Design a protein around this ligand. Structure first.
Ligand code: NDP
Ligand code: NDP
Ligand code: NDP
Ligand code: NDP
Lengths: 289, 289, 288, 288
């Protein structure tokens, strides 16, 4: 027999747990339990009280922040069995996560930070990129269970995964915002946004941002909700913590956190992350399309 | 075929004019006569004094800046004939170019800004990406003559081509520098720059910078010279002029010009643009690799 | 000798009042009612624009060099040789240099003479003046600056405007940075009153923390004395000064962009100090 | 009542001098020679670190909270109930709150009391003090602040450090922005001397342009009184204060980064004002 479990059935967790459920007997739990019941009916997982999650050989979590991961770890602490692996797909904090790992080790549980990239489309397709942090033996053991992933890279000990994820998202943030500033200026003087992007995406200034986010969500005015702006700002905050390690001159990334915070304050934490460009459109008095 | 003429036989112009020569009777001009004679002997073009360039149906220019384009336009003015087209491959200044376009229009000469991307490699291969600015009809008329290009995009009226070229390079600048800041922080905390990029290039933070510039030129320490840092700062200057049109809040792009200026002053204008990252390495006390 | 003042705005109205008490003063204003009002209040003489040419010294305090150029072109046909044009407008160095050339065609000597001290300074007649132009002309005009106290000759035509632009760029930075810091302190329970009491007796003090924030922000009064739109205009001129050498200027460059944000959200007619309300809106708290 | 001082540095040495001139003072320094020198000069008494616990009020002025904590742990087993700990170190609010709790275990009341006024202010005994802590404790220690003039109670433990950090961040921004502006002006032929004469009589004036730049930069004197490394440390603390609410603070955030550049290139041991030299190196001209 086999048994894994998933906690946190959100935008990412719901589809991620679906891949797990189709492959292994999977127990799922969600604060708003209705979501777990729906998941059971849709994928064949089994909705259970949080405590039963401790029955699994591999526990997965995809929560907002390390804060929530801590809460559920403390709730499960007395029931955790020796030999269990904890795969945290939360975009967490390196330091607080190293502490959590030490704490879980008290029960013989091996924590591995395993944040992902690829968004909800990647979660649904099961092609998420995973950046793992932790012991080499543990990493080898968990690979087969990552049913929702394609590219899996072991980047270092506990905390390195979250650190890499944070920096990756800070780069996405910077690339996206800069492209927004440039497109705003271009559109303002009669340049076709679509044609400009075709050029840019064939040139040196191309990025995932100009290739797969702006054309699809901004020019169309679709602005689909897939990744909360509040969560990206939270990621930028974690990236700032990574920069604090050595504090080498990092003018561009530091500022990136501040402009996205402006967007969060004006648009709300629940707007989609790409909607941050709407702030530039508001100031400019013109839409990017 | 109709006669064409190319002005400016530099690293880009020499090969570009070579592609034209293989298809049409081609007149070539270069400040330094030797280069034109060399081109004539190699491709069968015909080296001529500037004034004879007016014999062409289509005049092409690829000079350092709009200032040089102005100088040659001024000298040719008394000889320009109605029905002529002027394709400017120079990475020019949008506004100054629009003014030039009007003076040329008065002689019955239709100007189109047509900056290019793809570098000397693309010029040699004849696969350059062209961003055209100008009247629809004129664009239709000149497409058949762009023998050195593959992808040809009409981005807007006169000046739009130059604007997109400038903004593209500004985006490249930001993407590259930000990636430098983040990778520096990661390398400093023990994470392999190679491992970090493996994840990033398969994640949302990816860009041409992280995909094709940093791994090949920075991690390898090769730093091949393809585009001078001093020239990138110059393009950033043109990009700042584009931002000045509306002056909508553009903190990120504005800051980008300033940090690259720092690199230009400490590393020298002749260092390669990617070497700008050496400044981060110097401050960081560690190499990105 | 006779003098004249063009542009009776927030600064011009009181500035011309000081001239009127010392010299026969002719005044003109686009919205002529202000000139008539000025005549009744100070004893100056409201006159048609062309009559301004009667003066030995012409003063202007308009929004930008563009408006100064407009009135100069209008007066061109009437200007007399030997006349002086003292421009209190916060103008552009280059355009002003071209204006000086145009005016020399009529034998008129232009000098940029932008000021600092605000409307309170204009009313008190204690304005600081930064002059740009020939030293012979500077010496001839000094006696006429009845609305000024500290007067400094900083260089040739255009130098005064450049210094004013940089001065205001510093004011903007000091003001905004102070805002970001006070906001943070207020958020964690430290009153802006106590914080400023310390700051104004410490190394972080500036004219902004001493004479602007306590009086306009903590009181919630936000009086309108200097348009935010004009300060953004000044920052634009400062960016032009930075473009001369383009040496790394990250802080000043960023300053123009954040004040532009304030302008877009609060409007150009808000007071310059109201820029801090954008910080209050984002922070969800008042700086008090 | 007896007092004691730990950390006879650029600030500590003179500060403890003012104390020794009014109260029985015990002094200690890592490099004991300084303590002996102080004893000979002011009449204080150099003693082993452990003897400091004999004082009613213990004063410290070390590099960072890290050192204060280290000295605290060493003294912990000897601390007496009823003692007060006045920390003049420019410390971290959070770590200082933890330190206060630790000291409370021995019945010792900690108060953050960072200062402003530099070495000249310490020598003159006119330092501004920003106190964080219990009201009753503040009243008890006020009479012992012999090296201060203006003393403000800004909040509970940690608030003093928070205000100092923000104050210094404003100083840093004011200083650097002034550098960027003056550099541009000098490059176009305008004397920094003339520019500052105008600025210090205008809206852009600050303690930085009034008392640091003219005296240290224009003269090329660049005296060493406050390490660049310590200012960057203060900026780092300021960033931590900003992290409380994380309201948009682009200017102050950028300030930490440019001063870091100066530290990397000039070294943490250069004077804080020497940061402007980075601008001079890039600009290729001296600010005069
Ligand atoms: N969306 C994306 O594109 C990507 C997001 N991520 C990262 O994945 C993580 C989750 O993101 P996403 O799925 O969008 O988040 P959502 O906001 O969609 O979901 C958050 C989930 O966490 C649960 N939760 C919140 N608070 C608590 C709590 N106190 N106790 C228990 N459960 C709680 C929610 O329960 P409930 O249903 O009850 O509200 C919900 O299942 C984040 O760290 C994010 O940064 C990584 C890559 C991509
Ligand atoms: N190199 C690259 O990777 C790319 C460059 N570009 C753009 O192409 C343009 C030129 O670049 P590139 O070919 O590399 O330049 P080079 O420096 O190789 O060549 C410049 C050319 O301009 C001529 N020239 C210089 N000064 C004058 C003058 N005062 N009057 C007349 N001719 C003059 C030169 O003549 P002479 O031989 O006599 O010195 C030479 O032919 C620029 O606008 C650049 O931004 C676009 C994409 C890529
Ligand atoms: N306010 C302040 O605290 C300070 C302002 N300055 C500088 O002084 C200058 C004026 O500022 P301020 O007095 O506040 O401005 P206001 O907006 O109060 O006044 C502007 C004045 O210019 C006139 N004007 C505008 N357009 C035209 C035009 N096309 N032709 C003729 N007159 C015109 C107005 O006429 P009308 O009455 O008809 O509207 C008015 O008299 C600016 O350059 C500003 O940056 C310098 C220091 C301080
Ligand atoms: N200089 C200024 O203008 C101002 C400085 N401040 C703040 O005051 C504090 C001290 O600054 P300043 O006096 O210039 O510093 P200095 O570098 O001059 O002196 C530091 C002092 O701390 C001592 N010290 C360092 N490390 C240790 C340790 N591990 N254990 C015990 N003692 C140690 C030194 O001992 P030793 O002699 O043995 O090396 C020395 O007495 C800082 O927090 C600074 O930011 C505040 C206002 C102004």
């Amino acid at each position: 027999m086999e048994k894994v479990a998933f906690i946190g059935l959100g935008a990412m967790g719901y589809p991620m747990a679906g891949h797990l459920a189709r492959r292994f007997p999977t127990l799922v739990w969600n604060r708003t339990f209705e979501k777990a019941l729906r998941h059971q009916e849709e994928f064949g997982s089994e909705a259970v009280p949080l405590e039963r999650v401790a029955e699994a050989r591999v526990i997965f979590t995809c929560l907002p922040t390390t804060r929530e991961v801590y809460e559920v770890a403390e709730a499960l602490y007395p029931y955790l069995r020796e030999g269990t692996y904890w795969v945290d797909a939360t975009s967490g904090e390196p330091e607080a996560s190293r502490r959590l790992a030490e704490r879980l080790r008290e029960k013989g549980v091996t924590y591995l930070d395993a944040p992902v990239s690829g968004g909800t489309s990647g979660a649904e397709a099961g092609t998420l990129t995973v950046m793992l942090g932790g012991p080499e033996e543990a990493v080898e053991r968990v690979r087969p269970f990552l049913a929702y992933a394609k590219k899996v890279v072991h980047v270092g000990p506990v905390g390195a995964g979250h650190a890499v994820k944070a920096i990756n998202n800070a780069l996405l943030a910077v690339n996206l915002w800069a492209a927004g500033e440039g497109l705003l200026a271009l559109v303002k003087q009669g340049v076709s946004a679509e044609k400009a992007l075709e050029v840019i995406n064939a040139s040196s200034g191309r990025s995932n941002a100009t290739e797969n986010l702006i054309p699809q969500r901004v020019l169309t005015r679709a602005f689909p909700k897939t990744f909360a702006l509040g969560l990206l700002v939270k990621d930028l905050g974690i990236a700032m913590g990574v920069l604090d390690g050595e504090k080498a001159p990092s003018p561009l990334l530091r500022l990136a956190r501040e402009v996205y915070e402006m967007a969060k304050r004006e648009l709300g934490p629940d707007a989609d992350h790409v909607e941050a460009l709407r702030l530039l459109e508001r100031w400019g008095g013109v839409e990017i399309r």
